[PDB]
C-alpha cells in the first residue's frame, strides 16, 4: 500500500470510559486549525491538531445526566451565521445541538423511543440531520425550523435496531442497516420527499411516515450489520465476519437509479479482509476523496486500504485496546483513532 503513517502522539481522557466516536470537522476552511470531537460516557471533547504532533485540548461538554452514554456525533454549520455546530446523541435517545465555541447545549430533540446509534448531516443542506435508532426507525430532522421531516420505518422498515446509515455523495438517497441483517435504501430525491423537505422550511408540523424502502436485501450478511457507507454507486458494509463487503443492488450492469423496490438480486464485488474485529459496534471510515478506507480492530491495530487499487497496518506497542472509530482530517494528512480504554492516537501521513 502506497500510504504510510507515523504515530506522533497519544493521550487518555481522564473519565477512563470507552470512546465510541470521533469526527474531524470537515467544514473548517483552509488556513484554520484542524479540529476533532471525541464522544464517550456523558462527555463530548474537542481538540485542535498542531505541529510536532500536538493534540491541544480545547474544552469539554459534560451532560447533566451522569447515566447518558454518547455513541455518535456529527458536525454541521449554521447557514445564517456561518458558525460551526456539533450534534451528539446516545443511550438516552436525545439529540443535543452543541455550540462548539462555548461547548454548551443550545437545543435538544426528543422523539426516538430508544438509544440513537448514529447521526449524519446531509452533504448539501447543513440543516438536515439523520438519526438512526434502537427503536427500528430512522428520522430526518430540519434543525433550522426544529421539525421532524420524516420517519423511515413501519410496515417494511427495519424489524430490529438500526445501527448505521449513510447519505450518498450528492444527498439523493440513504442506505441504512441493522440487527435484522438487512440493508435498506431510502430515496430522498423522490417528489414526495423533496416536497416534505420544502414544507419543513415553510413551517404541529406533520411528519412524513415512510413505511416502504426503495430497495431491501438480507443477502449480503448473515448476521447484524453495524456499519454501512456509500462508495460512489457501490456500498461498503460490515458484520462480524472480519470483512467489509463491497456490493451493489441488482445485477452487475444495473444502474442504481433504475433499481425497482421489488429488485431481488444483489451483486457482491469483493471483500476487504482483516482480523480480530468480530465484536459488535466497530465502525470503518473513509477520507473525503474516498481514496482511503480505515478500520480499527479489538487489539488496537489500524488497517488502511488504498481504494484506488482495483493494506497498511498501523500498530503501536502501547495501543492494545479496541479502536471503535477513526477519522481522517479533510486533507487526509492526519488519522485519529479512539479506543475502549479512553485513549486517542494521532497518526500523521508521510
Amino acid at each position: 500500500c502506497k500510504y504510510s503513517f507515523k504515530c506522533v502522539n497519544s493521550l487518555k481522557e481522564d473519565h477512563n470510559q470507552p470512546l465510541f466516536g470521533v469526527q474531524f470537522n470537515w467544514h473548517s476552511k483552509e488556513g484554520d486549525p484542524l479540529v476533532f470531537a471525541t464522544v464517550g460516557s456523558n462527555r463530548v471533547t474537542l481538540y485542535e491538531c498542531h505541529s510536532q504532533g500536538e493534540i491541544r485540548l480545547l474544552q469539554s461538554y459534560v451532560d447533566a445526566d451522569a447515566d447518558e452514554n454518547f455513541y455518535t456525533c456529527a458536525w454541521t454549520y449554521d447557514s445564517n451565521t456561518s458558525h460551526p455546530l456539533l450534534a451528539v446523541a446516545g443511550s438516552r435517545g436525545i439529540i443535543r445541538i452543541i455550540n462548539p465555541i462555548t461547548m454548551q447545549c443550545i437545543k435538544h430533540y426528543v422523539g426516538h423511543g430508544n438509544a440513537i446509534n448514529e447521526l449524519k448531516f446531509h452533504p448539501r443542506d447543513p440543516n438536515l440531520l439523520l438519526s438512526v435508532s434502537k427503536d427500528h426507525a430512522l428520522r430526518l430532522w430540519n434543525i433550522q425550523t426544529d421539525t421532524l421531516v420524516a420517519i423511515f420505518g413501519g410496515v417494511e422498515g427495519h424489524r430490529d435496531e438500526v445501527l448505521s446509515a449513510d447519505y450518498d455523495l450528492l444527498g439523493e438517497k440513504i442506505m441504512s442497516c441493522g440487527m435484522d441483517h438487512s440493508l435498506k435504501l431510502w430515496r430522498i430525491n423522490s417528489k414526495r420527499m423533496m416536497n416534505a423537505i420544502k414544507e419543513s422550511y415553510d413551517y404541529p408540523f406533520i411528519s412524513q411516515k415512510i413505511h416502504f424502502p426503495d430497495f431491501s436485501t438480507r443477502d449480503i450478511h448473515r448476521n447484524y450489520v453495524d456499519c454501512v457507507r456509500w462508495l460512489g454507486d457501490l456500498i461498503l458494509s460490515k458484520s462480524c465476519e472480519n470483512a467489509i463487503v463491497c456490493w451493489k443492488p441488482g445485477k452487475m450492469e444495473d444502474d442504481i437509479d433504475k433499481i425497482k423496490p421489488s429488485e431481488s438480486n444483489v451483486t457482491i464485488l469483493g471483500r476487504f479482509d482483516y482480523s480480530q474485529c468480530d465484536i459488535w459496534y466497530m465502525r470503518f471510515s473513509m477520507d473525503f476523496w474516498q481514496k482511503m478506507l480505515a478500520l480499527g480492530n479489538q487489539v488496537g491495530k489500524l488497517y488502511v486500504w488504498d481504494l484506488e487499487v482495483e493494506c497498511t497496518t498501523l500498530t503501536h506497542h502501547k495501543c492494545g485496546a479496541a479502536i471503535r472509530q477513526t477519522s481522517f482530517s479533510r486533507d487526509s494528512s492526519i488519522l485519529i483513532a479512539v479506543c475502549d480504554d479512553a485513549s486517542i492516537w494521532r497518526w500523521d501521513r508521510l
Binding site: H27, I101, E308
Partner: peptide, 29 residues
C-alpha cells in the same frame, strides 16, 4: 470497467462538494 466508472463518479461528485466547500467561510471553533 465497473471500478473505473465508479471511480469517475466519485471524482466528479467529490469535486462538486469540494467546490461548494471552497465557496464557504465557516468560522473556526
Amino acid at each position: 470497467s465497473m471500478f473505473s466508472s465508479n471511480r469517475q463518479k466519485i471524482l466528479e461528485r467529490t469535486e462538486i462538494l469540494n467546490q461548494e466547500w471552497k465557496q464557504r467561510r465557516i468560522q473556526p471553533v
